[PDB]
Write a protein that binds this ligand. Structure first.
Ligand SMILES: Nc1ncnc2c1ncn2[C@@H]1O[C@H](COP(=O)(O)OP(=O)(O)NP(=O)(O)O)[C@@H](O)[C@H]1O
Ligand SMILES: Nc1ncnc2c1ncn2[C@@H]1O[C@H](COP(=O)(O)OP(=O)(O)NP(=O)(O)O)[C@@H](O)[C@H]1O
Ligand SMILES: [Ca+2]
Ligand SMILES: [Ca+2]
Ligand SMILES: [Mg+2]
Ligand SMILES: [Mg+2]
Lengths: 497, 497
C-alpha cells in the first residue's frame, strides 16, 4: 500500500529531510519504530503539497463545505441528507476533470484501500492545497479501525477541520474515540459549528455552549479550542439575525487556511520535533525491556510479567529521564503489540544514537529558526489562489454636545403639561400622545425603543425630548437609526468611557 | 449564632416538617449528624421566605445586579470598580428603609458573623423574596472558610446566581474551589454572563466558549448548566449588535426567579430528600466504625487504622447497601472531623430507625406528589411582585409567487446588454452601472448586499432583476428591508423547506 496523495537550493525543508535521515531514521530503524507506531518517512512527506482534512458525523456538511471552499462540485462525492459518502475521497488537483479509484498511483502485501477514491479537477485552490473528504462518523461493527486511520492523517495533514451541526448537535462516543486519536495534534484542529443560520439566536447559544462543555471534557487540554460559527453554504440564510458573525468567522477560517503554504515548513519542523520525542520514548521502552530480559532461561515468564508491569515500566522511565507523560503512547496498545514480538531479539540501549536525536532537538533545530524566520518573509505571498478565497466575493462596496438641547425647553413645556408623575411619563400616557402625531404604529414603536434609553417603560424629560426630536425627524422625512449613536444619547445618560 | 434571615391547614410544607421530625431527626440526633454535617432544622427553615444568593469574582456586577432587579439602591452595599463589598449583605424586606449589623435579630458560644449586615427596605419584590449579596471571590489567607459558608447557603437557598463578566473573564482557583462546595446542588445554579454588551460580538463568543469549556471540567456533571448572557444594567449598550439576545435572556432568568414562591414547596421536598440520603450514609459510616471497634483493649491503634482505612470503608459500604458515590461526603474532611470524636461513644447500627427513613423516601414522599401537584395549581399566581419584573417595563408597543416576474423580461434586456459573462455580471460592472442611478453609495451597498443572494460577488439575471426592483423601489421612495423576506428571494434560489 502506498500514497501518491502528497502531490544548490539548501532550504529549511531539505535541512529537515537531511536531519531526519541522519539523526532520527537510524534510531527508528534500530528499535523498529515502523513495526509499532509509524513507518519510515519518504521524500513525498517533505516535497508534497499541504493538505486539509475534513471530518465529522453524518450529514454535518463535510462534502458541502469542501464544495463551498471550491465554488465547484466534487466529481466523486455527492450531497445528500441520508448517509451518502462511504469512502475517503482525496480531492486533489487534476489537469482534466474526473476521478480514479484506489490502486492507481507488487502489493502481495495486500491492500484494503480499495475503498479510497481520488477526485481530480483543474482549480486555482487545488494548485495550492489538497483536500480530503472522509466518511461520516457513526452517531449513537465496521470493517476497519476508524480512529487509527485518523491518527495516521493527524501526523501528516496541515489542518484538521471538525464539523458539528447546530441544527442537531450530537457529540457521540465513536466521535469521542476519534478525538483521542488526534491527541498530540490539538493545534491542527479547527472546530466548525455549521448550519448556525438554521437555529434561533438563543438556541444557537445553547448548542454552542453544550458543544464546548462537551469538548472541554473530551480533549481535556487546558488550552481551549477555537470554534468557527457559520453556515458554509452558498444558499440564503434561514434566520439572518447573526449574519455578520458568520461572515466574520468564515473569513477568520479562510485566512487561517489560506496561509498554509506560507506556513508549511514550520508545521513540518514541529511535527518532526513531535515525532522525535515518541521515537526517543519508544527507544527507552524497548531498551529497558531488553535489559530486563534474561539471557536464555526463564524468559517466557519474564515476558508475560514485563507486559503486566509495563505501566510501572513507563512510570519509572518518566521519572529518571525527565519526559512528559504526553510523550508516551497508549499503554493498552503497547501491551497488545508487544505480544507479537520476540523480546530476545530487541536491541540494547545505545546512547550514541539517542545523543544524536537529543542534539538535533537541542541545537540543530534551534539553529534553523533564524533561517525559517527569513523564509517566512523572503518570498511567501503565494497563498491559496482564487476560489472562495477571492476578495471580490465580498462585493464591490467598501467630541460633541447633544443636538436637541436647543429645542429642549420647548419640549419640556409639552412634557410637564402632560402630567408625568415624579418627572416620569407613563408608557400608557406616552403612547396616547405619540399616536396623536398620526405616524404608523410600527415607526412609533421604533421611536419608543430608541427613546426609552434606561428601558424602564417610562420617559423622563430628556427621553421625551429625544422622542420628540425623532418624531420631528421622521415627520420631516428621515430614516431612524436602527441603534442610537452615542451622540444622540442624553448627556446625563451616556456611558462612562 | 442564629439566623433570622429566613423571613387545620394541613399543607405539604407542614407534612414535610412533620416527616422530618418523625423519621429523620431521630436518625440525625442518634448518630450526631449535627456535629459533622449540618445542625437540626428549625421551623424557620420551613415557614420562611424563599431566598436567592448572588456570587462571583470581584467587580463582576453582583451588587449592581441586585440593584437592577430592585430598580432601587441597596442601603448597605455600594457600587465601585475596586473591591468594595467585604461582608454578606442580607437584602431583605423592611417596613422602613435602613440597615442593621450582625448580632441583631447567650452566645457565649461565640460568634463570627459580626461581619454580616442586614439591609431592610420597603419594596414589592422583597414582599416575595430575600436576596443575599456576598463578598467577591478572590482572583489569582482569609479569616474564615469561604467555600463552607457557600455550602451552608447551598442547602437552604432557592437559586444560586453565579456571575462572570465577559469583559475580563477569569475562572480562578478559589472559584474552582467554591463550585466544589455547591456539588450536589447543581440544579439551583444559574450562570450569568454579565457585561456582554461590552465586548465585540465575535469576542463574546470566545469568552462564552472558554467559560463553558472551563465549567465543563470544574463541575464535571454530564448535565450542562444553563447560562444567561446579558448586561444586568440600567445603562445604555456599549455595542448594540446583540440587543435582542440579552433582553431575551433577561426574561428567561426573570421568569425563572419569579416563580420561586409558586415552586417553593417542591425544592424543600427535594432538599429534604437530598438531606435524608446524606443522613443515611452518615449513619452507616458511624455504625460501621462502632462495629469495627474493640470493646476495651487496643482501640487507640484501631482508630488510627480505621481513619486510614476510611476510603476502603466507604467503598465497601457503597457496594453492599447500593448507594451512589454522589451521596458520600468528602473523605479528606471526614478524616479530619473523626479525629475529634471518641470512637467508643459511637452508637450501634439500629435498623429500626434507618427503616423509617427508608420508608419516608419509598412511600411517604411518593404519596405527597399528588398533593403537591394540586398545590402547584390550586392557588399559586402570587409570584414575585412589581419591580424589574413588571410587564410595562418592555414598553407600550406590542404561499406566494415572486413579485418582479412581471417586470423580469424588461430587466433582462438591460442585463444582457451590459455584457455579463456566462450569465453573470461582475461586481465592477454592476457598480459602475448602479452608480449611474445617482443614488447614495450607502444605499447602493445595502441594495447590493440584499441582491447578491448567493454571495459570490457577481449578479446573475434574477439577482440583477432583484437589484433593479429594489433600485426602483427606493427611487419611488421606500425603505429597504434590513433582511430579504423569503417572498423576495428569487424562486430558484429559495431554501428547501
Ligand atoms: N450549511 C448548511 N446549512 C443547512 N443545511 C446544510 C448545510 N450544509 C449542508 N446542508 C444539508 O445537510 C445535508 C448534509 O449535507 P452533506 O454535505 O451531504 O453532509 P455530509 O457530512 O457530506 N454527509 P456524510 O458524508 O454522509 O456524513 C444535505 O441535505 C444538505 O442539503
Ligand atoms: N452590566 C454591566 N456592564 C458594564 N459595566 C458594569 C455592569 N455592571 C457593573 N458594571 C461596572 O463594573 C464595576 C463593578 O460593579 P459592582 O456591582 O460593584 O460589582 P461587584 O461584583 O458588586 N464588586 P465586589 O462586590 O467587590 O465583587 C462597577 O464600576 C460598575 O460600574
Ligand atoms: Ca425611561
Ligand atoms: Ca451572485
Ligand atoms: Mg459527505
Ligand atoms: Mg459588590
Amino acid at each position: 500500500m502506498f500514497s501518491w496523495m502528497k502531490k544548490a537550493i539548501r532550504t529549511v525543508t531539505s535541512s529537515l529531510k537531511e536531519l531526519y535521515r541522519t539523526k532520527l531514521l537510524p534510531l527508528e530503524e534500530h528499535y523498529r519504530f515502523g513495526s509499532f507506531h509509524s513507518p519510515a518517512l519518504e521524500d513525498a512527506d517533505f516535497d508534497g503539497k499541504p493538505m486539509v482534512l475534513v471530518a465529522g458525523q453524518y450529514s454535518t456538511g463535510k462534502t458541502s463545505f469542501i464544495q463551498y471552499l471550491l465554488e465547484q462540485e466534487v466529481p466523486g462525492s455527492r450531497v445528500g441528507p441520508e448517509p451518502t459518502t462511504d469512502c475517503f475521497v482525496a480531492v486533489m488537483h487534476g489537469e482534466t476533470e474526473g476521478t480514479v479509484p484506489g490502486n492507481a498511483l507488487n502489493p502481495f502485501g495486500n491492500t484494503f484501500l480499495n475503498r479510497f477514491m481520488c477526485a481530480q479537477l483543474p482549480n486555482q485552490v487545488l494548485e495550492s492545497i489538497s483536500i480530503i473528504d472522509t466518511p461520516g462518523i457513526l452517531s449513537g461493527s465496521r470493517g476497519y479501525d476508524f480512529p487509527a486511520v485518523l491518527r495516521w492523517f493527524a501526523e501528516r495533514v496541515d489542518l484538521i477541520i471538525l464539523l458539528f451541526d447546530a441544527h442537531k448537535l450530537e457529540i457521540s462516543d465513536e466521535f469521542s474515540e476519534a478525538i483521542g486519536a488526534l491527541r498530540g495534534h490539538e493545534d491542527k484542529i479547527r472546530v466548525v459549528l455549521n448550519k448556525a443560520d438554521m437555529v434561533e439566536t438563543q438556541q444557537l447559544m445553547r448548542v454552542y455552549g453544550a458543544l464546548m462543555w462537551a469538548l472541554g471534557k473530551v480533549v481535556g487540554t487546558p488550552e481551549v479550542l477555537r470554534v468557527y460559527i457559520g453556515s458554509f453554504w452558498s444558499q440564503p440564510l434561514l434566520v439572518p439575525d447573526n449574519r455578520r458573525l458568520f461572515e466574520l468567522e468564515e473569513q477568520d477560517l479562510f485566512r487561517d487556511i489560506q496561509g498554509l503554504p506560507r506556513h508549511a515548513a514550520l508545521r513540518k519542523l514541529n511535527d518532526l520535533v513531535k515525532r522525535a520525542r515518541l521515537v526517543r520514548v519508544h527507544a527507552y521502552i524497548i531498551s529497558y525491556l531488553k535489559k530486563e530480559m534474561p539471557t536464555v532461561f526463564g524468559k517466557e515468564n519474564k515476558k508475560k510479567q514485563l507486559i503486566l508491569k509495563l505501566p510501572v515500566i513507563f512510570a519509572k522511565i518518566q521519572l529518571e529521564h525527565h519526559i512528559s507523560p504526553g510523550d508516551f503512547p497508549d499503554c493498552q496498545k503497547m501491551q497488545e503489540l508487544l505480544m507479537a514480538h520476540d523480546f530476545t531479539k530487541f536491541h540494547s540501549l545505545k546512547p550514541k544514537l539517542l545523543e544524536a536525536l537529543d542534539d538535533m532537538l537541542a541545537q540543530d533545530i534551534a539553529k534553523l529558526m533564524p533561517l525559517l524566520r527569513q523564509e517566512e518573509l523572503e518570498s511567501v505571498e503565494a497563498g491559496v489562489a482564487g476560489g472562495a478565497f477571492e476578495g471580490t466575493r465580498m462585493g464591490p462596496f467598501v467630541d460633541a454636545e447633544w443636538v436637541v438641547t436647543k429645542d429642549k425647553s420647548k419640549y419640556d413645556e409639552i412634557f410637564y403639561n402632560l402630567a408625568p408623575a415624579d418627572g416620569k411619563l407613563s408608557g400608557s400616557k406616552a403612547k396616547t400622545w405619540m399616536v396623536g402625531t398620526k405616524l404608523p404604529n410600527s415607526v412609533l414603536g421604533r421611536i419608543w425603543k430608541l427613546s426609552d434609553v434606561d428601558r424602564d417603560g417610562m420617559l423622563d424629560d430628556e427621553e421625551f425630548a429625544l422622542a420628540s426630536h425623532l418624531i420631528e425627524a421622521k415627520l420631516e422625512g428621515h430614516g431612524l437609526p436602527t441603534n442610537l449613536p452615542r451622540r444622540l444619547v442624553p448627556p446625563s445618560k451616556r456611558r462612562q468611557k
